[PDB]
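Major allergen Pru p 1, Prunus persica. Tokens?
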Amino acid sequence: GVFTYESEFTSEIPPPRLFKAFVLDADNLVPKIAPQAIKHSEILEGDGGPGTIKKITFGEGSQYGYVKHKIDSIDKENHSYSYTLIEGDALGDNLEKISYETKLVASPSGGSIIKSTSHYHTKGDVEIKEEHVKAGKEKASNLFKLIETYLKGHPDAYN
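Tokens:
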């Protein structure tokens, strides 16, 4: 199930703080750093860890409805975080599912690289255009920028 989106962006914060924000409190982080379009996030499935199907309401503009995430692994000590995206506008009858896995890496001169790689199981004979991949990385790294400065600039941020 590939098209593949690798996406990377730096903040001025260490990996431990960023991983609380990107993995464990991520439903509280997400509308603080996707506020251009996103509202809330659901235990629709879950007991809060892997299995929790975090389903994410978009704003009153009707452009998306919802998007549905599923945490698939949460491991601070291995320092990566795996989640599926399974339903809503971002599957759009374009897409059958998307695996994500994130790592929050150490930049050689600065803070941490907020990094995700993700694999697009595409629907029927839909193939995803690179011009959507590109804008996709520009949305997705903009939320990784928003939290750059949020995790830094309200740095009690997931304190």
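Residues 1-159 form one domain.
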